[PDB]
Amino acid sequence: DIQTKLKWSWSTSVFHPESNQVMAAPIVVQLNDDNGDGKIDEKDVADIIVVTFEGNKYANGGYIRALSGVDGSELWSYSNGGVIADARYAPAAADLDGDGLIEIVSTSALTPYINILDHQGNIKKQLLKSASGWRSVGDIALADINGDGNIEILAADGVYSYESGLLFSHDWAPSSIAFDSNGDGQREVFANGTLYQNNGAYLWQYQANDTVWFSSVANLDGDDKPELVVSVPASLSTPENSEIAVLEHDGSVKWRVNNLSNPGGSVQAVSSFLGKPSSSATTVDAQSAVYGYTDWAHQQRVLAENHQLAIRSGAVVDAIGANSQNMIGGSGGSLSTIDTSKVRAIDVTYGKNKYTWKYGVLEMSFTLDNGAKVTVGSKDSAFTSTTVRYDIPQGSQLLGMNVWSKEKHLFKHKQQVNAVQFLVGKVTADQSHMGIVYAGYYAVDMYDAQGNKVWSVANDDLNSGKIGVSAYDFTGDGIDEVLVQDRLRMRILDGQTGRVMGIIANSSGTLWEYPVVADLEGNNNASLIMVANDYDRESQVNHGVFVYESANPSKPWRNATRIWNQYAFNFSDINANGTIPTNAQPSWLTHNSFRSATIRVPL
Numbered sequence: 001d002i003q004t005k006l007k008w009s010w011s012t013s014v015f016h017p018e019s020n021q022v023m024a025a026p027i028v029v030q031l032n033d034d035n036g037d038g039k040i041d042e043k044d045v046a047d048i049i050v051v052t053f054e055g056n057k058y059a060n061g062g063y064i065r066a067l068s069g070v071d072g073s074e075l076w077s078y079s080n081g082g083v084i085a086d087a088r089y090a091p092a093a094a095d096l097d098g099d100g101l102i103e104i105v106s107t108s109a110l111t112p113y114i115n116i117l118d119h120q121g122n123i124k125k126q127l128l129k130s131a132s133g134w135r136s137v138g139d140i141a142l143a144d145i146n147g148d149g150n151i152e153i154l155a156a157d158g159v160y161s162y163e164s165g166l167l168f169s170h171d172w173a174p175s176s177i178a179f180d181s182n183g184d185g186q187r188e189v190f191a192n193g194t195l196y197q198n199n200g201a202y203l204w205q206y207q208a209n210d211t212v213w214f215s216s217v218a219n220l221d222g223d224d225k226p227e228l229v230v231s232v233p234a235s236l237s238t239p240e241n242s243e244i245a246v247l248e249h250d251g252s253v254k255w256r257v258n259n260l261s262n263p264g265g266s267v268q269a270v271s272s273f274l275g276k277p278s279s280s281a282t283t284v285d286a287q288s289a290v291y292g293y294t295d296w297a298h299q300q301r302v303l304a305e306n307h308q309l310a311i312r313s314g315a316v317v318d319a320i321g322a323n324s325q326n327m328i329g330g331s332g333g334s335l336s337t338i339d340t341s342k343v344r345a346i347d348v349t350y351g352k353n354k355y356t357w358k359y360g361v362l363e364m365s366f367t368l369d370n371g372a373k374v375t376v377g378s379k380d381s382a383f384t385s386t387t388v389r390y391d392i393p394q395g396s397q398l399l400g401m402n403v404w405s406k407e408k409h410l411f412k413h414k415q416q417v418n419a420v421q422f423l424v425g426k427v428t429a430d431q432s433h434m435g436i437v438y439a440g441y442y443a444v445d446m447y448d449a450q451g452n453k454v455w456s457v458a459n460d461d462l463n464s465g466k467i468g469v470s471a472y473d474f475t476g477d478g479i480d481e482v483l484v485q486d487r488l489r490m491r492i493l494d495g496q497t498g499r500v501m502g503i504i505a506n507s508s509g510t511l512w513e514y515p516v517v518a519d520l521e522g523n524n525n526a527s528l529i530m531v532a533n534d535y536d537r538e539s540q541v542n543h544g545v546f547v548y549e550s551a552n553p554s555k556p557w558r559n560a561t562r563i564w565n566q567y568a569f570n571f572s573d574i575n576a577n578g579t580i581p582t583n584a585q586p587s588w589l590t591h592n593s594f595r596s597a598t599i600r601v602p603l
């Protein structure tokens with residue numbers, strides 16, 4: 001079990017003491033100079049931003065409050081009278097203008113502007129919204145979607161430039177995200193089932209039975225392309241309209257589920273829940289014999305990159321490498337490539353070269369899984385030769401080669417491959433460790449990448465059907481646990497089985513908030529942050545913000561993000577200091593997670 005103890009809590013204020021309920025996910029960013037060095041950066045203690053409301057008035061706006069990561073004390077003076085934001089959606093934060101200080105982006109149905117606050121809670125910029133009222137209120141995500149160095153704001157009624165304001169309008173969407181769907185370097189915008197180019201041009205639209213709420217991007221199959229996970233919560237009286245679905249980059253359905261035994265669901269977390277990322281990796285575990293002549297040559301290992309090997313060859317096999325720039329062998333021959341994932345056998349011809357009278361590899365003939373043959377070199381180069389076949393074992397793939405090439409007393413343009421050896425390994429599904437988890441009206445359900453349900457854990461959310469989840473590796477074994485919330489309890493669930501590993505009393509009427517793990521101090525021992533409200537008789541335990549830490553000093557919560565800057569958090573769109581990258585590498589090819597706090601190194 002995971003043992004916890006309270007780090008601090010916030011439940012009251014001298015500024016509007018009646019506004020003390022919270023029902024939107026917390027945000028974590030640096031807002032003050034804790035160490036007194038005149039700067040605000042990752043050396044300080046990250047802070048919490050929430051929106052508070054009074055009683056049951058969560059639909060009528062609330063106050064943005066900044067809470068110190070150290071002790072929960074309020075960092076702001078509210079000398080401006082406070083800033084109203086919608087209390088149902090978390091704001092978003094980042095250093096938008098590059099001055100080293102965090103800005104906070106939010107809006108409400110009561111203002112015609114997107115309000116951008118400085119780190120002290122005072123208005124800094126305003127952008128006139130496309131829509132008014134409830135149609136202009138939803139999630140906000142921050143990204144540089146066209147790579148021009150300026151940050152775009154993805155809001156409920158359109159996409160905005162921090163500098164120039166509204167770029168294009170769209171119908172109300174509770175959720176928007178950006179990702180490069182087609183590999184052209186530009187990020188498209190996905191909102192309420194519609195994929196737009198970043199100028200607003202329509203690309204495609206997933207036809208659903210009700211509003212499409214939050215989405216995740218991840219790699220859930222065997223290619224380098226992104227997949228999209230989407231939730232349609234519908235309502236408890238129209239459960240036939242709810243679903244969870246995985247879409248391909250072109251909008252086609254990979255799989256979808258309508259589950260009448262657990263309808264609803266507005267948001268998911270996607271992460272390494274079913275195993276460690278390494279448990280899905282294909283590694284070398286066997287090899288062929290050595291074919292050819294090893295005298296006066298040093299064995300050098302060549303592993304295939306992107307399941308490809310490069311080969312230069314003419315009359316004979318001259319050089320082999322992972323790519324054309326890092327090749328073992330002589331300088332001659334023309335260039336070809338081999339798709340190693342398709343190779344099922346290789347015939348190697350080695351012997352005395354009739355042109356030079358040297359001994360080496362004269363030809364290799366690859367048999368592919370479709371029966372086609374790819375050859376390099378030529379058997380006709382032999383004065384004498386031997387031909388041998390190596391079969392790739394069933395269930396294994398060709399992963400690389402050991403290559404011998406003699407240099408002594410040879411011109412570089414006459415050096416060649418003198419011996420070869422094939423390296424193979426057992427094949428495994430590239431995403432067998434990945435899971436998709438979400439909460440419905442009745443339970444938290446975990447799915448594998450193919451749409452098979454792995455487990456279901458009863459979780460009372462009859463009042464909403466949209467409650468959120470997040471992910472974090474509390475135990476430190478490389479596999480994320482699931483963080484869940486219902487009317488009365490926050491719980492930690494085992495990723496592989498759903499077993500309950502921790503329970504914390506924490507009440508909420510529930511909307512779509514989730515708990516957050518973040519390493520506030522940066523010393524590799526994280527904090528667990530959750531919001532609470534007690535206005536409803538069926539969820540009357542506590543109210544405010546409650547922050548926990550590991551109760552066992554020999555069990556620190558390691559490798560947690562220093563920052564959780566928006567509701568659609570997935571690392572790749574934020575740096576630790578709060579700046580936003582101009583061209584971030586694709587999340588689905590690095591940590592391949594969404595709404596996980598766990599810092600992961602790719603591959």
Ligand SMILES: [Ca+2]
Pocket residue numbers: 032033034035036037038039040041043044
């Ligand atoms: Ca400082």
Ligand SMILES: [Ca+2]
Pocket residue numbers: 030031032033034044045046047068069070
């Ligand atoms: Ca701080």
Ligand code: NA
Pocket residue numbers: 094095096097098099100101102103
């Ligand atoms: Na800034």
Ligand code: NA
Pocket residue numbers: 143144145146147148149150151152
């Ligand atoms: Na931009």
Ligand code: NA
Pocket residue numbers: 179180181182183184185186187188
């Ligand atoms: Na694109």
Ligand code: NA
Pocket residue numbers: 218219220221222223224225226227
């Ligand atoms: Na993919």
Ligand code: NA
Pocket residue numbers: 472473474475476477478479480481
């Ligand atoms: Na774990």
